[PDB]
Amino acid sequence: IQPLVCDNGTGMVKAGFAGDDAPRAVFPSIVGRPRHTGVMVGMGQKDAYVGDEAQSKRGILTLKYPIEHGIVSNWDDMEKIWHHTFYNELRVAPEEHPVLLTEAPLNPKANREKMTQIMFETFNTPAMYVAIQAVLSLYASGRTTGIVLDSGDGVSHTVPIYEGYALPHAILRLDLAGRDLTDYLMKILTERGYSFTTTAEREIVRDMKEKLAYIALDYDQEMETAKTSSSVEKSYELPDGQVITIGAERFRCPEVLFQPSFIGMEAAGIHETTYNSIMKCDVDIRKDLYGNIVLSGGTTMFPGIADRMSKEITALAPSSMKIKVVAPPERKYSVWIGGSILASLSTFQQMWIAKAEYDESGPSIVHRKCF
C-alpha cells in the first residue's frame, strides 16, 4: 500500500516506494531506435531499448529523450518508459499502489491532463497527485521557509516559500539547463579537435560533463590562469581508449549557467534569476529567504557551485544580510525524498485524486490547486 513516488524528471526517471530513502529505479529517460538494420519481427531482435539497455546499446541506436524541457511532446515513447518502469524496474501492478507524480512548474495544462488520462485509463491508477518538484525538495530539506532552485536538465525554476503558504506570483522558470551545457560542450570541444555529433557522442559528452567539469570562483582570473599549461588541463579515457586533454573547458561549461549570453539564451543568470525571485517577493520575507537558499537537482552537483552562488548573490544583495547558500548531498534525489515524505503523510491522504473521482467530475479535476 506504499504509494509510488515517480520523479518524472527530464534527464533520468527516479522511482521507488514511499517511506524509503533511495529510489530503486535510477535510469535515464531515453528510448533508443536502431539505425542500420531492419525492424523485421520474424527474426525479431527487438525494436526499442529503454534506459539502461539503451545505455548498453548506445552505439547502434538513435537515442532521443521523449520529453522536451518538461513538456512530454511524445506520448508513445513516454508510455513505453512508464510500463517499462512498472513491469521491469519496480515489478508491481500499477493498480496496487497509488502514483505520486512530479513536474516542473508552469507547464501547459494538456501535459498534466493527458498524463493523468494515461495513468487513469491505460494503467488504471487507483489514485494520484501531481506536485511541484521544488515544494518536494523543500519538504525533503526539512525546513518550512526557503527558496528551492531546481535545475533538472531541461528546466531551471526557482520557487520561494515562506512557512508554507506557497507563492505562485514569484515562481519563475528558465530553459537554460544541462542540455544546453552538453550542447555547449560539443561546441567548445570542436576547438580541441574532437568531433562529437551523434547521440552516443552526446551521452559521452554528458558523462564528461558529470565527471570532469568543475566551476570556478572568478571566471576572469581562472581564464588568466588558463594561459600557462597548468593543472586545469586534464585527460579522459573514451570508451575506445581515446584520450582528450581538456584544459580551460573544465570551468567554462558551468560559466554558461552564470553567463547565459555565451550560448545566446537571452535571459538572466541563475544568480540573477534567484535574486529577481527575491525582488518579486516583498520585504519581511527576504531575510528568511536570503538565509535559506537551497539548491536542488542534479545540475547543482558541480564542485564549488555553492561558493560560486555565494559572493554573487552577495554582490546583488545588500552587504548586511546573511547569504547562506545551502547545498546538501543527494541534491539529485531531493525531489524523490520529498515525494516519499508527502506520500507517507496521513494529512496528505485527502489529496489522492482517485480514478473514481476522475469519472465523477471529469478531466478538469487536475487544477484544483490545493496542498
Ligand X SMILES: Nc1ncnc2c1ncn2[C@@H]1O[C@H](COP(=O)(O)OP(=O)(O)O)[C@@H](O)[C@H]1O
Question: For Mg ion, which stretch binds (CB under 5 A), given 45-53, 115-123, 146-154, 284-292?
Answer: 146-154
Residue 301 is a binding residue for ligand X (CB under 6 A): yes
User: Which of 302, 340, 343, 358 is in the footprint of ligand X by CB under 6 A?
Assistant: 302
- Asked if residue 308 belongs to a known ligand binding site, the reply is no
**Residue recorded with cell 493498480:** 95
Question: For Mg ion, which stretch binds (CB under 5 A), given 2-10, 104-112, 222-230, 345-353?
Answer: 2-10
User: Which of 3, 9, 154, 339 is in the footprint of Mg ion by CB under 5 A?
Assistant: 9
Tell which positions 117-146 bind a second copy, by CB under 8 A.
Answer: none
Tell me the closest approach of the beta carbon of residue 301 to Mg ion, in angstroms: 11
Tell which positions 120-179 bind ligand X, by CB under 6 A.
Answer: 152-153, 178
Question: For ligand X, which stretch binds (CB under 6 A), given 3-11, 76-84, 168-176, 235-243?
Answer: 3-11
Question: Which does residue 323 bind out of Mg ion, ligand X, a second copy, none, counting CB within 5 to 8 angstroms by kind?
Answer: none
Do 148 and 137 contact (CB within 8 A), yes or no?
A: yes
- Identify which of residues 12 and 136 has a Cβ nearer to ligand X in the complex: 12
**Residue recorded with cell 554528458:** 206
- Asked if residue 109 belongs to a known ligand binding site, the reply is no
Question: Which does residue 124 bind out of Mg ion, a second copy, ligand X, none, counting CB within 5 to 8 angstroms by kind?
Answer: none
User: Which of 3, 5, 6, 11 is in the footprint of ligand X by CB under 6 A?
Assistant: 11
- Asked if residue 12 belongs to a known ligand binding site, the reply is yes
Backbone angles phi, psi at 149, to 5 degrees: -110, 90
Residue 242 is a binding residue for a second copy (CB under 8 A): yes
**Residue recorded with cell 530503486:** 24
* Separation of alpha carbons 306 and 106, rounded Å: 26
Instruction: Extract the C-alpha cell encoding 88.
Output: 521491469
Residues in the chain: 371
Instruction: Extract the C-alpha cell encoding 20.
Output: 524509503
Residue 32 is a binding residue for Mg ion (CB under 5 A): no
Residues contacting ligand X: total by CB under 6 A: 16
Tell which positions 305-364 bind ligand X, by CB under 6 A.
Answer: 332
Tell me the closest approach of the beta carbon of residue 233 to Mg ion, in angstroms: 31
Tell me the closest approach of the beta carbon of residue 104 to Mg ion, in angstroms: 10
Question: For a second copy, which stretch binds (CB under 8 A), given 12-20, 32-40, 118-126, 291-299?
Answer: 32-40
Residue 363 is a binding residue for a second copy (CB under 8 A): no
Residue 195 is a binding residue for a second copy (CB under 8 A): yes
Residue 28 is a binding residue for Mg ion (CB under 5 A): no
Per-residue b or e along 129-161, where b marks 16 or more CB atoms closer than 10 Å to that residue's CB: bbbbbbbbbbbbbeeebbbbbbbbbbbbbbbbb
**Residue recorded with cell 489514485:** 127
| Interface mask toward a second copy for 307-336; x: CB under 8 A | ----------xxxxx---------------
